[model samples]
Target chain A: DRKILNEILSNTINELNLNDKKANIKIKIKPLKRKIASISLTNKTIYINKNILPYLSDEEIRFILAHELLHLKYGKYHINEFEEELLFLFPNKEAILINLINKLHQKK
Target chain B: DRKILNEILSNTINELNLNDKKANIKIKIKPLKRKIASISLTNKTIYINKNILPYLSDEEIRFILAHELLHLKYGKYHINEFEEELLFLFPNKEAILINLINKLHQKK
Candidate 1:
């Protein structure tokens, strides 16, 4: 119950300052099988794999948090406009994208 | 046929130096609903949402890749020994979890 990093991130949400006043997003780690993270409007929460906790960087986690938050802010679906904003939010966007492409399509 | 990033990630697997003999994992981007990723051994592939591509940071994507690849190298599921690993692999653990829990428990 006394986690320090969570304390900071909870406070950080106000910094995101989303347009929705009711946008009080909550994050939790749970047994989501193998997916790193998933969002649920039914529960008003984002579910991340507890297993992924040790594998992802804080920045990566925050990046994920924001991604889920975007879904929360808009609706439980993909939005092209919302996605465009992420370009500015993520650091080293091109390099990271290229890296992801490598992960996705690189051949053996 | 012209995605540059997928081309690169296919090549990074060798860089990770996983031990299994048939570690020739394949990756693909697909309509995965809202989940960022999932794996299916029936076809030996990883599935990511094509929509999320515009939103996620590359580093965050690789963390996801490493997370999924771990599932692959250890044989199609969560293994305790395999998890002990994200410990060795992922960089910023403590902060991310705390941040995640904070996101989960913060007040509206």
Candidate 2:
């Protein structure tokens, strides 16, 4: 299950033109209840919420992964241009975000 | 014992002219056996070795605290200039470091 998630992360990094930074980025699956994904700049690790993973489609996972990678790519400037880059990659951003929220709120 | 350590940290931060960054910095007491103190850039927390705190003198603790604070001040460039800055604050740098090494090796 996690292997598939890992592959999606790898593919999205390549798609985002962040292949050089791939070695620095690492992922950890955690039971995050409130947030779907979080990035740690200190350790260069991304924490994926395991609670929401199973319910998400591959493209939806890529959307979330791209969001966090964008944070690393731009650092402090990520916020100013985040939506522009994210929407460019995933045109169906609204649908994906809504699905994620629905999955997060559903009693599991 | 920890109260005294906290005070030493506060005093040294002022002495080092890093009082401006003081609000962002934090301290943690952990059962670290091998290392006396470790700094977390992500959380801006300095973890003082609980095992060794009681054994160290206040001056020695100031030396260690200054070293970590210097790391935050200079970020990536801290290492090249660390020793000179530390020695300026605590002239007995060698003696303090030796005492710390001895404490790390001693059996409880």
Candidate 3:
């Protein structure tokens, strides 16, 4: 799952054409009880929930990454524009995101 | 100055097609020693440094709001892409941002 997280994070950065600052961003996988993932801009680190990692699909992971990456790059301004930004990257984002969210809430 | 900040924040949200989420976001002005503005996603609040507010131009305030808005919307994912996002919104972003930053750090 940790390996999957690294792979997905790297691939999303590449997809966004952010390879230059690739090394500057750090990655960590740890316990996040409620949130699946989160970021710290001051330290340039991305954290993934260790518990949830095993259950997520690569596409789902990408969706999560895209949101975090925008936060890193854009500083969380307009929520709707972020959706449009994601749409620019993922045309079928809604279906994929809904599927991902349902999977996240599924009873184990 | 607080009124100017509010105006710029509102206009930026409108420009980004995020008027629907306007009421959901809260605004506050207070002292910030190092940073001019920051946002709290958990509280859905945007904070402006009271010290810097009086010294800033409306355009500079908009630039700050743009970054915070992106942070609110996108979850801070890719840092470079955020620059591109700003560029999309403001064609002369570099000049305006440089001016803003210079104004920010100018010796009082």
**Residue-by-residue lDDT tens digits, candidate 3, B1-108:** 556667777778877666776546768888753345788878978888776677777677777788778775554468577667777887776566545543443324
lDDT of 2 by residue, A7-100 (tens): 8878878877888855467889887533457888678788876755667777877877888788767755555576678888888876666455
Candidate 1 per-residue lDDT, tens place, B1-108, comes to: 325456545644554565345455677877543255677756767787675554455555666667666665564255666666666766564444334333433322
| Angstrom error at residue B47, model 1 | 16
Candidate 1 wrongly placed segments (more than 4 Å)? A1-5, A75-78, A91-108, B1-108
**Candidate 2 DockQ category?**
incorrect
Least accurate 10 contiguous residues by lDDT in model 2 chain A? A99-108
Q: Give the per-residue lDDT of model 1 (tens digit) for A1-108.
A: 227446535744555565346455567877553255687766767787674455455566667666666665554254565666565687564454334333333222
B49: Cα error in model 1, Å: 17
Each model: TM-score of chain B? 0.65, 0.80, 0.77
Among all candidates shown, the one with the greatest TM-score: 2
Model 3 ranges off by over 4 Å: A1-108, B78-81
Candidate 1 docking band: incorrect
State model 3's lDDT: 0.68
**What lDDT is reached at residue B87 by model 2?**
71
lDDT values of the candidates? 0.56, 0.70, 0.68
Q: Candidate 3: deviation at residue A3, Å? A: 42
